[PDB]
Amino acid sequence: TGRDDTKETVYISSIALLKMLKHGRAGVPMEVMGLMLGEFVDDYTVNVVDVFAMPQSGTGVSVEAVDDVFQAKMMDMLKQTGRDQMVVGWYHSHPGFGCWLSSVDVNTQKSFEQLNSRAVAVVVDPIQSVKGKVVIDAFRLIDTGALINNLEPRQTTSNTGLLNKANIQALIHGLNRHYYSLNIDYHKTAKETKMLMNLHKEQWQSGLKMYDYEEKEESNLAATKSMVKIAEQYSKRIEEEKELTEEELKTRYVGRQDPKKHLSETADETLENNIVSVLTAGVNSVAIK
């Protein structure tokens, strides 16, 4: 019968993830562009080793803006280093709207389907993302033909599928009738993790430096006064507070913005701090002489 037609779990390296973020953010508002370099093996494995952002084009995402002079040139330099990788798709940002292929972009992505048969269009939306995690999705062309010939069920085998409910109407219609969405995973080695994880030794050298000690008194003093003012409302609150029905009590004795909670919070902050302050002061003194 038919081929599996299971969209690739797109293993987008940590290096590729950070790198789309830089180009895309700085380049606001102009919708940026570039190719994704990687390797496709098996039926559902693409690893995107690296990406590179093509020079800005004032035309915006267009068939104009995809260009082979840049394509050739970067790859020829990577020949010299042996870091050469084939074009396996393209990324761009729509930052002025969420992650979904435009009517113009579906024509464009089809050109790339001729180049490479497992070509992706990965829309990275940089302004609207607040963390570089949410509103980022991956796509791959599903023909017009598929829609007519009821071949969409073949297309979603061996997958869990991803729906983006938000953004509808039009946009959603186009999305459903153009591409297929699948989960995006981030792969990294643990040598990378250790780098990410790393800081310095001057990190702890700073952690042995001590503030001026009058300022520390200021904080201890302040806390005591701080807590006096909120201890009156707490004092008032528990005078009676026996009256039937909890919901009523919450308005009457101000159980919202809870004074009991707020007192324990301030006490506890100042307390953990003053244990570190006495400890550090003693450690330094005995250590040195």
């Binding site: 019968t1 039926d43 690893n47 069920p153 979603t156 085998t157 643990a190």
Partner: protein, 237 residues
Amino acid sequence: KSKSSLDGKFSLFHTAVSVANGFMHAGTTDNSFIKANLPWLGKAQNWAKFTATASLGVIHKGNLLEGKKVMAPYLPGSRASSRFIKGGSLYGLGLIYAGFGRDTTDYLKNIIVENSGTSGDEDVDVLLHGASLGIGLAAMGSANIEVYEALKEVLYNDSATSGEAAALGMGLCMLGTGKPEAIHDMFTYSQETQHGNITRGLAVGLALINYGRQELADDLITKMLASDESLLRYGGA
């Protein structure tokens, strides 16, 4: 119910009906389901059609003698219309013949050696996935080393989806032996393979082979949990 509500063209639905029904009629042959749900059956495609032939073996569990007979047109040689049929019959045979006779293991063993080259042809990848699950089932608790060697050759070929099937198949055959040479090879290979399905297969196989292995699996557990891969930790557990 199955025909009326659940749609046969949609693949996920069709898998659910095939599995529920396979059990309904299990442990005695039944062709009642084929006949009732005949139009329904023609709709099938892709992996819905692999599951459709393998369903037959869950149904036909027991009645061992007539197990082979019914599966006769679907085998390779007698079928080359559809690779999903060819492959899902061999999985299907192995269900009936789970833990029973070793005359069956022999047949499947031939098919593995034939295709342990290039699984790069499209038909071959599907075929060889079923063959590999199939022979593992058939050889359960035999501790046939011949089987084990055959499924190594699939692994090292680095067949796309059959790599997983083979890895599982080893642990089902050699069930509970804790042969150390087997343990060493699997564990080491799983690091090399970058493709996750093959990796999952070997993680889980390492557990199977150490069935009832008690405190002699203790060497294995420390390595798998400490392995930085999430995959090996999952099978570690």
